[PDB]
């Protein structure tokens, strides 16, 4: 099993200064075919996490060129020069190269002190120990059947985790073995919706849930979301 190590946990940098974040895997994440799928995501506190970099060094559309990072094998290094206030947030490295795709521990980018397409999600859910939940994700503004649908669990405590993915065509679900398919990804192409179910609910199961959507990143689809999210609280 592959583990992702993100360094450092937190970093202070004043405006304009260089910024560098190292992501070191357990071993080579180079895909057998000869590609390498590694992404850089930015979580702006109180918003949708969105994609910055896909496929090693390739920048996502609409992203400033001051964001650039490279690497191979294990080592991958993301640099940001000319830091502004919109560059602020907690960054995550993500490998989709080997199943299960894993995330980094995140790095809060903070400051030194001194001197239209979108996917709607269901409302927040309050639940009891073991009750189910069906989370609905409705796509708007793009071709639904084009993109795979990943799901991602987010806690302040246990960070980011990949739930599982599904192919809109054949219901091509592939689930994280930690989740053991105890959750279920379904797709109704009629209204273009991707639901998600889960039964057993513990304290640790309490989290926010996002539905991963958007591409290109050649000859594979659907990495970043890039949408609202749904707060699920397990109430004792």
Q: Does domain 1-115 fall into CATH 2.30.33.40?
A: no
> Which residue from 2, 127, 104 is spatially nearest to 53, judged by alpha carbons?
104
Q: Number of H helices and number of E strands within the chain?
A: 0, 21
- Whole-Å CA distances, 136 to 80, 122, 173, 194: 36, 5, 16, 6
> Could you count the other beta carbons within 10 Å of the beta carbon of residue 218?
10
CB-based contact 136:121 (threshold 8 Å):
yes
Residue-by-residue DSSP string for 152-178: EEEETTTEEEEEEEE-TTTT--EE-TT
Indicate the resolution in Å: 3.5
> Which residue from 72, 52, 74, 55 is spatially nearest to 63, judged by alpha carbons?
52
Region class of 144: left (phi > 0), else alpha (psi between -120 and 50), else beta: alpha
- Whole-Å CA distances, 94 to 8, 149, 166, 212: 15, 16, 18, 13
> Which residue from 74, 82, 112 is spatially nearest to 17, judged by alpha carbons?
82
Residues near 155 by beta carbon (within 8 Å), at least 6 away in sequence: 204, 206, 207, 208
CB-based contact 130:205 (threshold 8 Å):
no
Helix/strand/coil percentages in the chain, nearest 5: 5, 45, 50
> Structure tokens of 26?
């357990």
Instruction: For residue 77, say if its preceding peptide bond is cis, omega within 30 degrees of 0.
Output: no
> Which residue has 């994609």 as its token pair?
51
> Structure tokens of 115?
């001197």
Q: Method of determination?
A: X-ray
> Which residue from 40, 228, 9, 22 is spatially nearest to 105, judged by alpha carbons?
9
């Amino acid at each position: 099993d592959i583990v992702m190590t993100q360094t450092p946990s937190s970093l202070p940098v004043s405006l304009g200064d260089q910024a560098s974040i190292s992501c070191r895997s357990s071993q080579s994440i180079v895909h057998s075919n000869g590609n390498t799928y590694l992404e850089w995501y930015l979580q702006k506190p109180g918003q949708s996490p969105k994609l910055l970099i896909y496929k090693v060094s390739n920048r996502f559309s609409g992203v400033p060129d001051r964001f650039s990072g490279s690497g191979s094998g294990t080592d991958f290094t993301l640099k940001i020069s000319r830091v502004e206030a919109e560059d602020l947030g907690i960054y995550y490295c993500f490998q989709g190269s080997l199943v299960p795709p894993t995330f980094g521990a995140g790095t809060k980018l903070e400051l030194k002190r001194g001197g239209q397409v979108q996917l709607q999600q269901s409302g927040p859910e309050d639940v009891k120990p073991g009750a189910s939940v069906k989370i609905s994700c409705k796509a708007s503004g793009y071709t639904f059947t084009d993109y795979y649908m990943n799901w991602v669990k987010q806690s302040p405590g246990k960070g980011l985790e990949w739930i599982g993915d599904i192919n809109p065509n054949n219901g091509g679900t592939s689930y994280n073995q930690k989740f053991k398919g105890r959750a279920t990804l379904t797709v109704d192409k009629s209204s273009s919706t991707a639901y998600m179910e889960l039964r057993s609910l513990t304290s640790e199961d309490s989290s926010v849930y996002y539905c991963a959507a958007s591409s290109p990143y050649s000859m594979r689809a659907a990495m970043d979301y890039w949408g609202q999210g749904t707060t699920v609280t397990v109430s004792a």
